Design an enzyme around this catalytic site. Structure first.
Site, PDB file in Angstrom:
ATOM      1  N   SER A 140       0.830  -1.188   0.000  1.00 46.77           N
ATOM      2  CA  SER A 140       0.000   0.000   0.000  1.00 46.77           C
ATOM      3  C   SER A 140       0.878   1.257   0.000  1.00 46.77           C
ATOM      4  CB  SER A 140      -0.947  -0.005   1.203  1.00 46.77           C
ATOM      5  OG  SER A 140      -0.237   0.133   2.437  1.00 46.77           O
ATOM      6  N   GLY A 146       3.787  -0.656   4.335  1.00 45.28           N
ATOM      7  CA  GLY A 146       3.523  -0.514   2.919  1.00 45.28           C
ATOM      8  C   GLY A 146       4.353   0.520   2.203  1.00 45.28           C
ATOM      9  N   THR A 179      -7.052   4.249   6.542  1.00 38.23           N
ATOM     10  CA  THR A 179      -6.826   3.960   7.951  1.00 38.23           C
ATOM     11  C   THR A 179      -6.109   5.099   8.673  1.00 38.23           C
ATOM     12  OG1 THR A 179      -4.624   2.837   8.074  1.00 38.23           O
ATOM     13  CG2 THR A 179      -6.446   1.539   7.119  1.00 38.23           C
ATOM     14  N   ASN A 206      -8.278   2.615  -4.282  1.00 41.81           N
ATOM     15  CA  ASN A 206      -9.243   1.896  -3.460  1.00 41.81           C
ATOM     16  C   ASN A 206     -10.673   2.367  -3.711  1.00 41.81           C
ATOM     17  OD1 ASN A 206      -8.005  -0.165  -2.169  1.00 41.81           O
ATOM     18  ND2 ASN A 206      -7.775   0.870  -0.193  1.00 41.81           N
ATOM     19  N   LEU A 252       4.439 -10.330 -20.967  1.00 37.06           N
ATOM     20  CA  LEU A 252       4.227  -9.042 -20.326  1.00 37.06           C
ATOM     21  C   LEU A 252       5.375  -8.080 -20.603  1.00 37.06           C
ATOM     22  CD1 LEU A 252       3.275  -6.822 -18.466  1.00 37.06           C
ATOM     23  CD2 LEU A 252       3.590  -8.381 -16.555  1.00 37.06           C
ATOM     24  N   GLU A 254       6.928  -7.714 -23.301  1.00 37.45           N
ATOM     25  CA  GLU A 254       6.687  -7.111 -24.604  1.00 37.45           C
ATOM     26  C   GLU A 254       5.675  -5.970 -24.542  1.00 37.45           C
ATOM     27  OE1 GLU A 254       6.919  -9.991 -27.575  1.00 37.45           O
ATOM     28  OE2 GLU A 254       5.182  -9.106 -28.628  1.00 37.45           O
TER      29      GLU A 254
HETATM   30  N1  LIG Z   1      -7.319  -3.288  -1.401  1.00 37.62           N
HETATM   31  C1  LIG Z   1      -6.918  -3.446  -0.143  1.00 37.62           C
HETATM   32  N2  LIG Z   1      -6.360  -2.382   0.538  1.00 37.62           N
HETATM   33  C2  LIG Z   1      -5.949  -2.532   1.820  1.00 37.62           C
HETATM   34  C3  LIG Z   1      -6.082  -3.755   2.462  1.00 37.62           C
HETATM   35  N3  LIG Z   1      -5.596  -3.622   3.716  1.00 37.62           N
HETATM   36  C4  LIG Z   1      -5.158  -2.352   3.881  1.00 37.62           C
HETATM   37  N4  LIG Z   1      -5.377  -1.663   2.716  1.00 37.62           N
HETATM   38  C5  LIG Z   1      -5.041  -0.254   2.457  1.00 37.62           C
HETATM   39  O1  LIG Z   1      -3.760   0.028   2.983  1.00 37.62           O
HETATM   40  C6  LIG Z   1      -3.709   1.340   3.507  1.00 37.62           C
HETATM   41  C7  LIG Z   1      -2.934   1.345   4.821  1.00 37.62           C
HETATM   42  O2  LIG Z   1      -1.769   0.556   4.708  1.00 37.62           O
HETATM   43  P1  LIG Z   1      -1.646  -0.870   5.450  1.00 37.62           P
HETATM   44  O3  LIG Z   1      -1.111  -1.902   4.487  1.00 37.62           O
HETATM   45  O4  LIG Z   1      -2.981  -1.305   6.008  1.00 37.62           O
HETATM   46  O5  LIG Z   1      -0.588  -0.625   6.643  1.00 37.62           O
HETATM   47  P2  LIG Z   1       0.753  -1.513   6.747  1.00 37.62           P
HETATM   48  O6  LIG Z   1       1.284  -1.796   5.362  1.00 37.62           O
HETATM   49  O7  LIG Z   1       0.496  -2.797   7.498  1.00 37.62           O
HETATM   50  O8  LIG Z   1       1.823  -0.598   7.529  1.00 37.62           O
HETATM   51  P3  LIG Z   1       1.638  -0.277   9.097  1.00 37.62           P
HETATM   52  O9  LIG Z   1       1.259   1.176   9.248  1.00 37.62           O
HETATM   53  O10 LIG Z   1       2.941  -0.526   9.819  1.00 37.62           O
HETATM   54  O11 LIG Z   1       0.550  -1.152   9.674  1.00 37.62           O
HETATM   55  C8  LIG Z   1      -5.144   1.803   3.696  1.00 37.62           C
HETATM   56  O12 LIG Z   1      -5.376   2.953   2.918  1.00 37.62           O
HETATM   57  C9  LIG Z   1      -6.007   0.668   3.185  1.00 37.62           C
HETATM   58  O13 LIG Z   1      -7.007   1.147   2.317  1.00 37.62           O
HETATM   59  C10 LIG Z   1      -6.642  -4.830   1.784  1.00 37.62           C
HETATM   60  O14 LIG Z   1      -6.765  -5.919   2.342  1.00 37.62           O
HETATM   61  N5  LIG Z   1      -7.059  -4.669   0.478  1.00 37.62           N
HETATM   62  C1  LIG Z   2      -6.587   3.296  20.326  1.00 38.48           C
HETATM   63  N1  LIG Z   2      -7.727   4.174  20.247  1.00 38.48           N
HETATM   64  C2  LIG Z   2      -8.317   4.414  18.953  1.00 38.48           C
HETATM   65  N2  LIG Z   2      -7.491   4.662  17.935  1.00 38.48           N
HETATM   66  C3  LIG Z   2      -7.970   4.895  16.725  1.00 38.48           C
HETATM   67  N3  LIG Z   2      -7.036   5.165  15.631  1.00 38.48           N
HETATM   68  C4  LIG Z   2      -5.979   4.260  15.333  1.00 38.48           C
HETATM   69  C5  LIG Z   2      -6.101   3.830  13.905  1.00 38.48           C
HETATM   70  C6  LIG Z   2      -6.007   4.961  12.915  1.00 38.48           C
HETATM   71  C7  LIG Z   2      -6.756   6.243  13.396  1.00 38.48           C
HETATM   72  C8  LIG Z   2      -6.941   7.320  12.504  1.00 38.48           C
HETATM   73  C9  LIG Z   2      -7.610   8.473  12.926  1.00 38.48           C
HETATM   74  O1  LIG Z   2      -7.790   9.539  12.031  1.00 38.48           O
HETATM   75  C10 LIG Z   2      -8.449  10.662  12.541  1.00 38.48           C
HETATM   76  C11 LIG Z   2      -8.091   8.541  14.244  1.00 38.48           C
HETATM   77  C12 LIG Z   2      -7.904   7.480  15.127  1.00 38.48           C
HETATM   78  C13 LIG Z   2      -7.231   6.318  14.712  1.00 38.48           C
HETATM   79  C14 LIG Z   2      -9.399   4.867  16.541  1.00 38.48           C
HETATM   80  C15 LIG Z   2     -10.000   5.083  15.277  1.00 38.48           C
HETATM   81  C16 LIG Z   2     -11.367   5.059  15.119  1.00 38.48           C
HETATM   82  F1  LIG Z   2     -11.874   5.281  13.881  1.00 38.48           F
HETATM   83  C17 LIG Z   2     -12.198   4.797  16.204  1.00 38.48           C
HETATM   84  C18 LIG Z   2     -11.631   4.572  17.448  1.00 38.48           C
HETATM   85  C19 LIG Z   2     -10.212   4.608  17.607  1.00 38.48           C
HETATM   86  N4  LIG Z   2      -9.641   4.379  18.820  1.00 38.48           N
END
Ligand SMILES: Nc1nc2c(ncn2[C@@H]2O[C@H](COP(=O)(O)OP(=O)(O)OP(=O)(O)O)[C@@H](O)[C@H]2O)c(=O)[nH]1
Ligand SMILES: CNc1nc(N2CCCc3cc(OC)ccc32)c2cc(F)ccc2n1
Ligand SMILES: Nc1nc2c(ncn2[C@@H]2O[C@H](COP(=O)(O)OP(=O)(O)O)[C@@H](O)[C@H]2O)c(=O)[nH]1
Ligand SMILES: [Ca+2]
Ligand SMILES: [Mg+2]
Lengths: 440, 421, 67
Positions: A140, A146, A179, A206, A252, A254
């Site tokens: 990602s 990622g 995320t 995505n 691929l 090519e």
């Molecule tokens: N298409 C698809 N996207 C994913 C999936 N899991 C996570 N993502 C995307 O990956 C992005 C975040 O990167 P992640 O791969 O989840 O995080 P990571 O690579 O484990 O790196 P860390 O921060 O250390 O956890 C997000 O924007 C998600 O949309 C999946 O299973 N399928």
């Molecule tokens: C440990 N407590 C905790 N942490 C969260 N995170 C970690 C994961 C990425 C993350 C991104 C954010 O963008 C604004 C805010 C929060 C968060 C969290 C996220 C939720 F959507 C709901 C409850 C949550 N509660």
């Protein structure tokens, strides 16, 4: 020979590897214990599927793959899941602490702790290869692993494998599944740090995949399992030329000749058809010409952009299943007259076509209709630079207030890396403008 | 495993810390002995985050009980569940703090502190992967405020790369008459800005007003207030204690919620005190905030929402999309997609659908402005300086905490005023 | 023409190499400036946490100047 090693990095990369390697097995008739009744060449062979699978003396076919994640949650699911038996443990590499959505921890802090172990595992795979072709790196943009670890690994792969080919499958971040608020920062940093070390990178937006699932399969709120199963189909079409034999089958590499006009312009736009539900596919048979038209509907692209408001520097069609060239040729001729396909003035307008006769597969209990024929189009269009503008705009909003930048600097990075990365992106966007301008 | 190490201090600290352990023990399926009588294994998946595993299949809170008076310490084990705790992890003084901050930070707490540190290390070194710590305390009660902030300072010196997450309880003249609380809180804040990664502001004024106005309790008890706090506290840990789409931990929350290291004071919210639109509506309503602040008086830097219960999340997606659309001028425009939400299947005991709301709002300056006013009413008078300057402190030590907290709101107002174009 | 045939193959090697070089060096430079940086930051955090213990000495020694 011509073996490809796949490297799956972080959550998205690892889970998409699950999707992909489960699909490959179903395509090649490999069972979850690695056995393949049709392979009579025991312990080896040079069949096409051997580009992705090695064979043990005991008859097991083993993915030429390596999963790396800075934490163990996601890879523990592999270690215990349906295909646990496929992978030798050494292939599944986890740490203890993840990158906490931070490029810096992924690239430097946490990631320096595991890189050598990873490269050592990659080496143990390369050493089984009689003629290694290159690497396929799934990761990602958004995650800290990622993005930061991928780019560390890419830098290191360039050192240990020189110019040997590195292709990317990169997950471009979407608000609907994001995320982390910081995903634009990680995105620009890894795109900059990797640009010199990647030869060809297929981006998956995505939101594009989310919309396609919602529209064409109507999943109300698609999951990663919904998204990944569709991604794997597109990945399978791109690699089908390496894993399958075929008279009408085009390597691929090519297509890469045509897809990369300059080293930095190496981001092809993928479009796949048909993505249709079992119920909507019943009694409705989609012709070569129907699926071919779909490729030029922007709502079927992996990345959201308008190719209609940009220019083509390349256009490729990878067909699999019940397709013959006469149909293809007919379909193209109609689309040519009836659609908006403008090429830059410096490259020929022909369409490059490949055909694999092996029909697409669906995964049990999936939402995708099993169709008789399918197509993935790979085009190099200036339009893709829209995705860089969107991302570059989000980056700018936060970086002007230096929001969150302290979590990066406290891990050892400098503001200068941010502006250096952003400037590269600004030049990338200008390169995409320059290539489309007419000649003098 | 990702282990948080828990830490209660002072009077208010230990009490709100107890009901915490009661509630999550019940959600996770753990009785006052430390054995698991639960239905779903989802209650054990992440159970190691807050629980030491002991043979005989006994789960022991990774908790450190602390106070400078043994009264609160006795009531703990006597209290419901007192016998699931580790007896070594009680660490009591005798003298007491007498509501003096200088007694908790520099002198009498300073002596008991190295004994607490010893208990931290033992539990810390037993961790596969230490997330960090959460401390429950108050910012008015001398032991929780002064020693708590000293124990933070000391833990950070030895774990400078672990997250320091505190639940701090804010003094309200509607709940305690003791005159020196504007002094204690302001001296604690001067520390909390510098040495914590994330502080949930648990405002007693907001807990009192809630029980009075919404709950219509004419005279509410520290047990009515603390009923609010455990529902809050159970919410903002649900993503630590249970699986989810996101791998929530204390650092990922800091990264995503703290755009600037100092602005780490969060406004918590709970609902109900129902349909997905009502939770969402209420949970953004100033009447459901556990800090006496109006969101419509500043702007959100970042927000996190936890939906607990069994609901059409596609609904939650549109509902949460609705609130930002209809309330767009209240989220800073220079942080895109600054509202995240998670959804958990297990609701707290008694509600079929809760929602918990964590908010980095520049309207928190509202809370700090209140305390800065009560402070200066005294400091302009020099009132009670002897309780502190007698314990060895300079006057410039009060002026400095006062200018520090002054700045913290200047900065909150700087980013509320900031624009994109 | 053979002289030129070996200059081209020598140039491809020369460049494939100079590339593996500048990578190898760009990494080591980045990783080193990063270790320095991250450490400078943690040392700063301690030097100031430790000035907090010297002010807990000065504070307690003032209250012994009280008896
Ligand atoms: N298409 C698809 N996207 C994913 C999936 N899991 C996570 N993502 C995307 O990956 C992005 C975040 O990167 P992640 O791969 O989840 O995080 P990571 O690579 O484990 O790196 P860390 O921060 O250390 O956890 C997000 O924007 C998600 O949309 C999946 O299973 N399928
Ligand atoms: C440990 N407590 C905790 N942490 C969260 N995170 C970690 C994961 C990425 C993350 C991104 C954010 O963008 C604004 C805010 C929060 C968060 C969290 C996220 C939720 F959507 C709901 C409850 C949550 N509660
Ligand atoms: N919400 C809440 N606040 C409390 C509670 N106990 C004490 N406080 C607050 O904390 C302040 C006194 O701190 P205290 O806990 O007595 O310090 P300690 O004696 O050293 O532990 C007062 O302003 C109270 O308002 C409680 O159970 N709930
Ligand atoms: Ca064989
Ligand atoms: Mg991860």
């Amino acid at each position: 020979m011509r073996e490809c090693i796949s490297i799956h990095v972080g959550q998205a990369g690892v889970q998409i590897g699950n999707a992909c390697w489960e699909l490959y097995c179903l395509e090649h008739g490999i069972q979850p214990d690695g056995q393949m009744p049709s392979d009579k060449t025991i312990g080896g062979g040079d069949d096409s599927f051997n580009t992705f699978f090695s064979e043990t003396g005991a008859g097991k076919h083993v993915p030429r793959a390596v999963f790396v994640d800075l934490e163990p949650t996601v890879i523990d699911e592999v270690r215990t899941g349906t295909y646990r038996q496929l992978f030798h443990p050494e292939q599944l590499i986890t740490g203890k602490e993840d990158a906490a959505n931070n490029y810096a921890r992924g690239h430097y802090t946490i990631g320096k702790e595991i890189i050598d172990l990873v490269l050592d595992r990659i080496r143990k795979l390369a050493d089984q290869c009689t003629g290694l072709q290159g690497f396929l790196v799934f990761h990602s943009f958004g995650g800290g692993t990622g993005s930061g670890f991928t780019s560390l690994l890419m830098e290191r792969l360039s050192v240990d494998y020189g110019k040997k080919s590195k292709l990317e499958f990169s997950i471009y971040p979407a608000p609907q599944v994001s995320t982390a608020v910081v995903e634009p920062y990680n995105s620009i940093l890894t795109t900059h740090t990797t640009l010199e070390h990647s030869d060809c990178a297929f981006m998956v937006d995505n939101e594009a995949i989310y919309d396609i699932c919602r529209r064409n399969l109507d999943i109300e709120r698609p999951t990663y399992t919904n998204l990944n199963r569709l991604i794997s189909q597109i990945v399978s079409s791109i690699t089908a030329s390496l894993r399958f034999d075929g008279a009408l089958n085009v390597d691929l590499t090519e297509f890469q000749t045509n897809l990369v006009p300059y080293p930095r312009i190496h981001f092809p736009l993928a479009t796949y058809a048909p993505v249709i539900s079992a119920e909507k596919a019943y009694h409705e048979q989609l012709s070569v010409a129907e699926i071919t038209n779909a490729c030029f509907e922007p709502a079927n692209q992996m990345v959201k952009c308008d190719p209609r408001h940009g220019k083509y520097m390349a256009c490729c069609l990878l067909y699999r299943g019940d397709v013959v060239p006469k149909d293809v040729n007919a379909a193209i001729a109609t689309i040519k007259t009836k659609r908006s396909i403008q090429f830059v003035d410096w490259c020929p307008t022909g369409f490059k076509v490949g055909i694999n006769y092996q029909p697409p597969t669906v995964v049990p209990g999936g939402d995708l209709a099993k169709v008789q024929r399918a197509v993935c189009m790979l085009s190099n269009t200036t339009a893709i630079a829209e995705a860089w503008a969107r991302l570059d705009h989000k980056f700018d909003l936060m970086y002007a207030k230096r929001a969150f930048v302290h979590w990066y600097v406290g891990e050892g990075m400098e503001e200068g890396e941010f502006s250096e990365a952003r400037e590269d992106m600004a030049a990338l966007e200008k390169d995409y403008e320059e290539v489309g301008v007419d000649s003098v | 495993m990702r282990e948080i190490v828990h830490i209660q201090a002072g009077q208010c600290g230990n009490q709100i810390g107890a009901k915490f352990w009661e509630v999550i023990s019940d959600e996770h399926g753990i009785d006052p002995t430390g054995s698991y009588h639960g239905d779903s294994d989802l209650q054990l998946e992440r159970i190691n985050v807050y629980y030491n595993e002991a043979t005989g299949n006994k789960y022991v809170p990774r908790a450190i009980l602390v106070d400078l008076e043994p009264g609160t310490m006795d009531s703990v084990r006597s209290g419901p569940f007192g016998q699931i705790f580790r007896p070594d992890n009680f660490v009591f003084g005798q003298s007491g703090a007498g509501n003096n901050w200088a007694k908790g930070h520099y002198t009498e707490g300073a002596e008991l502190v190295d004994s607490v540190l010893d208990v931290v290390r033992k539990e810390s070194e037993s961790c596969d992967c230490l997330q960090g710590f959460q401390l429950t305390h108050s910012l008015g009660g001398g032991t929780g405020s002064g020693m708590g902030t000293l124990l933070i300072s000391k833990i950070r010196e030895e774990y400078p790369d672990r997250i320091m997450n505190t639940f701090s309880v804010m003094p309200s003249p509607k709940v305690s008459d003791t005159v020196v609380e504007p002094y204690n809180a302001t001296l604690s804040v001067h520390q909390l800005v510098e040495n914590t990664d994330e502080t949930y502001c648990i405002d007693n004024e907001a807990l009192y007003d809630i029980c009075f106005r919404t709950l219509k309790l004419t005279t509410p008890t520290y047990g009515d207030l603390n009923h609010l706090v455990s529902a809050t506290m159970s919410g903002v840990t649900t993503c630590l204690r249970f699986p989810g789409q996101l791998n929530a931990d204390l650092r990922k929350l800091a990264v995503n919620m703290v755009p600037f290291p100092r602005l780490h004071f969060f406004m918590p919210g709970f609902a109900p005190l129902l349909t997905v639109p009502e939770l969402t509506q209420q949970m953004f309503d100033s009447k459901n905030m556990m800090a006496a602040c109006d969101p419509r008086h500043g702007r959100y830097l970042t927000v996190a929402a936890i939906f607990r219960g069994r609901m059409s999340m596609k609904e939650v997606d549109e509902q949460m999309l609705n609130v930002q659309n209809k309330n767009s001028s209240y989220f800073v425009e220079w942080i895109p997609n600054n509202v995240k939400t998670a959804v958990c299947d297990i609701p707290p005991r008694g509600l079929k659908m809760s929602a918990t709301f964590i908010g980095n709002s520049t309207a928190i300056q509202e809370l700090f402005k209140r305390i800065s006013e009560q402070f200066t009413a005294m400091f302009r008078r020099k009132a009670f300086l002897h309780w502190y300057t007698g314990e060895g402190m300079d006057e410039m030590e009060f002026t400095e905490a006062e200018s520090n907290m002054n700045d913290l709101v200047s900065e909150y107002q700087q980013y509320q005023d900031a624009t994109a174009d | 023409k053979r002289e030129h045939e070996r200059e081209v193959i020598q140039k491809a090697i020369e460049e494939n190499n100079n590339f593996i070089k500048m990578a190898k060096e760009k990494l080591a430079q980045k990783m080193e400036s990063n270790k320095e940086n991250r450490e400078a930051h943690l040392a700063a955090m301690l030097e100031r946490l430790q000035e907090k213990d010297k002010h807990a000495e000065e504070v307690r020694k003032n209250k012994e100047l009280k008896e």
